[PDB]
Structure formats: C-alpha cells, structure tokens
Amino acid sequence: PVVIKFSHVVSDDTPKGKGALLFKKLAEERLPGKVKVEVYPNSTLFGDADEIEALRANKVQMLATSLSKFEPYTKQLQVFDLPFLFDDLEALKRFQKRDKSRELLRSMAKHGIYGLAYWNNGMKQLSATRELHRPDDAKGLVFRIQPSSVLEAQFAMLGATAKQLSYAETLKAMQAGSVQGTENTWSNLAGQKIDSVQPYITETNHGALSYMLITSSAFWTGIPYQTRTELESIVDEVTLVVNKEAEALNQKEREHLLAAGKSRLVSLSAEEHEAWRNAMKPLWKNYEAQI
C-alpha cells in the first residue's frame, strides 16, 4: 500500500482542507489496499516554513502550497501574485486552463517538485487597524504577507511596508503590534482569528490566493503506473470540486466573520475601487518583461 501523507497549514473546514479530505476519501474508496491517504491539517505534520523541503526530502508526499511561496524554486509563478490581474476566481480559472499555465505545473521539475493541479481559495481582502477607503489610507501601515517579493513590492508601492511571516505567525505579530494589517481571503482571515485585533476589513478583491497541488517527482514516479494514473484522475475530480465550491465557502466565512462583530466591513464604491486598481496595477510593469 502506497502511503500518501498530505500536509497543510489550515483547518479541515477550508477549501484546501475539504479538498484533502475528499482526496483521501476518493483514493481510499477507489484504490483499496493500493493507496492509504493520511491528512494532516493545521501544520500538525509540517508547518509553513519547512513543508516544501520536507516534501522534496520525502518526509511528506503531498502539499497544496500557495503560488506566492515558490520563489526559492522558480520565478515562473510570480504572475499569479500581481494585484487586480484577475477580476475573480472565474478569470483566474480560465487562465489556469491555458496550455502555458498547464506547463507551469512542471516549472520546478529541476528541484524535483511535480505539479498536479491548481486549487483556488478566493480573492484577497485587506484587514487593518483602520478603514481603508482609499489607497493613501494604507500609508505607514505594516502588513503581514506571504513570503513573496511580488507582494512585498505591492505594499511598498502603496507607501506601506510588508512583513513576511508564516500563516501561523500572523496573529501573534498583530497582538504584539509589529503588524497592523494583512491581506487574505475571508476563509483565512477567519481562520487566523485576527478579527479581535483588526477592527476593519476592506473588501478590495485586490489579488488571488491560489494553490499548486504538489508532490515530489521521485515519489510520484515510484508509484506503480496503474495506480498513479488512477490517482491522477482522482486529483482532476477533486480539483473540479475544490474550485467550484471555493468562492461559496469564502462568502459564508465573510458572513460569519462579520456577524461576530469584531471586524466591520468597509465597502468600496466604483470610484474607490478604480483608485485602488490605479494605485496597484503599475506593479505589473516591473514584471512584464519576464512574463
């Protein structure tokens, strides 16, 4: 029986967590005796900082890692971090079906990383210690970001500063006062439990949070062809479900977070939205020559 340990840093009740449990469910139903899938949510196996190296070392067999986190291995995924490039998950989804996007699943082959699929989460919002009606309002704040140079440059362009931190390090830094804001989907803003220290969340939809489902090439190649083939069909199946339900899950988490009353929703007019887009889109020119 081939063991696939699936490690991730969020809860079971998230787009990624439901996907991993469904991958376990389908694999173990369809390939009994051939494959056993163990799911480890909430960094119980490996955390944000060391999960990818654990995968390449075959300490774990499957991850679903943010596209923003792959710069130590490739610069080919930076396109996905650009603000306001994708209107919503539907637009992102159409991009990911292009042949060239399919090819990006192999961009880290040189480091033994094998891409299996894109799993989407949702669009990023901005939480902060104050209302963010206009881009100028962001000035002087320190935002927690994922460890991406693109996302760092994004906040620098706004006259803000970014602090690169892991998913789990975010709340304590806000509690300490070294971070005053962050960007994330409704599901993760809820999951981090930062509403107690983030009185305002502005619905900016300014970037996408998306994952590459990955394994190590050495592990995946060692799986008997029949079984590997099957597992890849299950992956495609789980992936359709993940991407079809992600937005609805994020909208329910928005409702429940706002219902708690700790964070208040800041809503943008068309003109304010255009102002944010006009402030952040010039970042694309820094990456256009590569892309």
TrEMBL record:
GO terms for cellular component: outer membrane-bounded periplasmic space. It comes from the Bacteria. Gene3D superfamilies: Bacterial extracellular solute-binding protein, family 7. Keywords: Signal, Transport. One of its GO terms (biological process) is C4-dicarboxylate transport. (S)-malate binds at K16, K69, R144, N184, N188, Y211. Belongs to the bacterial solute-binding protein 7 family. This is Probable c4-dicarboxylate-binding protein. It comes from Pseudomonas aeruginosa (strain ATCC 15692 / DSM 22644 / CIP 104116 / JCM 14847 / LMG 12228 / 1C / PRS 101 / PAO1).
